[model samples]
Target: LSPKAATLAERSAGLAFSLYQAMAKDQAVENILLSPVVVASSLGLVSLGGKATTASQAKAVLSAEQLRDEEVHAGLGELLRSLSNSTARNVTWKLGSRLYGPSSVSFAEDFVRSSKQHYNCEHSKINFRDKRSALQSINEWAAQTTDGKLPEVTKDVERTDGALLVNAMFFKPHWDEKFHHKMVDNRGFMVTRSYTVGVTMMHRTGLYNYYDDEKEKLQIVEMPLAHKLSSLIILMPHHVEPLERLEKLLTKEQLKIWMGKMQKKAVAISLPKGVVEVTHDLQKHLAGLGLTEAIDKNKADLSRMSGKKDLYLASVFHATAFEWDTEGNPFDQDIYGREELRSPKLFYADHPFIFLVRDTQSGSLLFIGRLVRPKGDKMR
Candidate 1:
């Protein structure tokens, strides 16, 4: 990857965390999930058609401030190419975007073509008055792109809205070192000192990539997923501290340092089996992240999308799904750990924790989630 691509990827991690903070505010006890990659990619496609302030505002929201429009496009292209070209042995992924404009006017040809060139986006024409059919069609597109993991688009929207861009991203990856089903059992998840939940924990003991951030009261573990191109990082807080302390202080710069310090460690881990699914409109929270102008329908400038001033973003929607548990799959233990080791460290995700699925090549975040209340999580 080029330097620009790497830079954009790094900033995207920060953007993901920022959005996580916004979503984490009001929920008392809930599982949180978001696809930062899909959200940014879909909006980045819209930015391709923006001119003047519209273009700049979208760029800022996506954390593309460091690079020009062409550079951002090229960076996204490189990331998608790597993901699409791989038919990894244990990972299945689908990612794409689409743009819909009312039939009243034609969008600039350059904008549509640029969408294809940069994001593989499909451009379509739709009726502005018939919202029911239009919404049904958009839901179909999302369902197909995500392999039915997400079957609907719930953003409060109408066809009369100037234009709409939908981004769909999905992944169901297998663990390279699959956890054994025999060791799975109901384990205690300490929601608090007085309250606890019994969660189905997948037990595993192996030598894995890990980093101990004693200074920050946290220990980080890297769980290798299918296709070495990506891995899941679980950030567990120290037993004496709350997970919020670590979460509130996390930053892209801190992540960069922590990942660099990952070393092989023999560890015994108990991770819960659960599924995270979320559908939300990202417009307001994004404005809180400094893209106020883009979400402001009245003052926003989106002329490049249709060469008209009236068409601005009506709504923005994002959805993500992640499921993980033990399955029947054989693996070679010698490759990752030393069976000859004396003692392995202990790591338990029995409490609230933060997790991120990352694309290693470009450092892009595939998903960001938190496991706060273990019992309520949906099962796959």
Candidate 2:
């Protein structure tokens, strides 16, 4: 990725933490997953057609306050291009954006052209009165794009809605260091101080980028995926205490410090095998991040996109799907355990922890989630 694009990706990473901070503020036991880069790209496309404060507010929310509109578009466009060129064998992903609107309201020709050119966003016209057809159209598009990983993105669409801006991202990646199925077993996952849930745990011992932050009472590990194309950052607390304190301090600066502390070392890792999917109606959450004007029907000015002054954004639905397991390339042979070695550090994830996936080249945050209660098969 180009330097310009990497800068924009860093900004998107900041927005990712901000969105997680908003989503995790009220909940303790819920799992959260989101695509920060996808959401930022979708909003960037929308703000391109916005006028006055609508564009500025969205830019500020995206952490691109000093960037020009064209520069932002160019940077994101380059980022997407780089993503498509990934050579990672075990990772499969899809990132897509679309706009569904009524046929009566026609968008500006320039806006449509620019969105397609830079963001790859397709604008489709559907009858809002026919709710069933509208839902099927949007849902089918989402399912097809994500390879059936996310089928129902939204259950309901308002008839009065002017436009529904939707973004969907899906990720399924196996570790570079394979976890053989023979080593998989059922274990108890600590949900809290007293409650424990059964989970399918995979065990592996190998060299990884890791750090044991004794001061912070946590451990950080970076597991490379598929020829080092991307990495998953795992932040596990030292004890069975709740993750509220660590979560509250989640920011770009804190993440940088943790990553800087990481060093290559041998570790015996144990993590659950599971899938996580989350859909967010982002009006309230975006509002919490100072993005109030775009969703406000009375104050929004989207005249650049449509002649209808009332055609403000109705909802920004963001959906994400992620799965990790012992699956890996069948052709690759197990290279570890060939020689005897000293005792390695044990990093067990039998409790709640935060996980983030990012591109190794440009460091763009593709998926971020907290695994509180992993969905695993019951122990026999």
Candidate 3:
């Protein structure tokens, strides 16, 4: 990605994390997701970076640069911007200007000049047709740029003619490296007041940065992606109590303090390994987050799209799936001498944990979510 894209990405990533903490404080889950999508779309409109060219390529980009600072920032920004813009209006829409490298200032200046020229030349009055074409071209370009990894672009522009644009990227690698399977064991995962289930568990011993205050306890762990960013931190409460207390304590200022105070100390951690799938209807969530103004058909500001007075969000949806497994077997005697017959370590994730979707470019956060359960069920 270009340096400008990288910077924007990082800023967005940090914003996602900051927003997550803010939303958590208010118990606003819906806004937590919607805001990020909106911001990401805005940033994508100006992005001029490398294109992935395929769905696999897009996924590969996430994996390859999961731990890289630039990638994390870019990814988060892209995710928020695309989703938000999609829900805004029905007209041809595009975000990010597709400039690359460190010369973003120069490139953007040139882009603005060309864009203005095009606009003036085509519009003696108002060339809505040319503007629409530009938006369509940019959307197609972004889809082609990232390949099909991002399916956020609409195909039936002739029918709906969306006016806004959105895009986002997310990367997380393990802070505490994933362990081998031999050290894993089946255990009970408690949910709510009584629900519990058998789940695979992993264990490890290492130096970790930890904190415990009256309100909540905190720990930072990592999950390394195969090729890209790593999951740097997992914030959870110390007791098996309601999330309200933790939520109240998760302010951006508190989070900053916690991060700063974190020290590398010896620790032992155990987590679960299993299949998790979550699907969230972001529209409802957004309503809950106090963003009702943007989606109100009668109140939305989308005159720039089609000169239409009435428009609002019909629906918003998001789905995520995660599976944790061992990288390789630890029992093979041939790989290691018989004298060192060690079992693979394990990592378990049974309780509620908050995750930050970060960009590697500028150490920014694009999105953040608290995984209370695997199946996009009610927040705990």
lDDT scores for all predictions?
Answer: 0.71, 0.78, 0.40
lDDT of 1 by residue, 1-380 (tens): 68876776666666777778887774552666776656666557657776677678778877677687778888777666655432242245666577776777688887777778777888777675767777788888888877777777764474356667666656665676788777777778877666777777788888689998888888899987755667788998877344567877778778889989999888888888754455666677777777666566677777776777767666566655555667534788674455635577788888888888877666567678887775354422
Sort all candidates by TM-score, best to worst.
2, 1, 3
> Residue 12 of candidate 3: its Cα lDDT?
46
State how far residue 235 of model 2 sits from its true place (Å).
Answer: 0.1
Model 1 lowest lDDT segment of ten: 82-91
Residue-wise lDDT of candidate 3 within 1-380, one digit each (tens)? 45545554544444444445555555434223322434343222212111222112222322322334345445444443433221122111222223111111122343334323321111111112555654365345444533423333333232122222223222212332446657777766665547665666666654455554434554554433323332245666655555656666666687778778765554556765643433233343334434453445554433322233333332333333333444421233353343322432222456666655443433445346665544332122
Top candidate when judged by TM-score against the true structure: 2
lDDT tens per residue, model 2, 1-380: 77778888888878878888888876642788877667677668658878888888888888898888888889988877766544342247777788876778887798888888988888887787778888888889888888887787878875356678888767777667678777788888998979999987788887788899888899999988777778889999999877788897677788888888888787899987665666777767887887788888788778777755757788788877776678664433444544522577899899999998888877788778888876554343
- TM-score of each candidate structure, all chains considered together: 0.81, 0.88, 0.51
Q: Of the candidates numbered 2 and 3, which has the greater TM-score value? A: 2
Clashing pairs in 1: none
Better of 1 and 3 by TM-score: 1
Model 3 global lDDT (CA atoms, 0 to 1): 0.40
Worst 10 residues of 2 by lDDT: 332-341
Each prediction's number of clashing residue pairs: 0, 0, 90
Question: In terms of TM-score, how similar is model 1 to the real structure?
Answer: 0.81
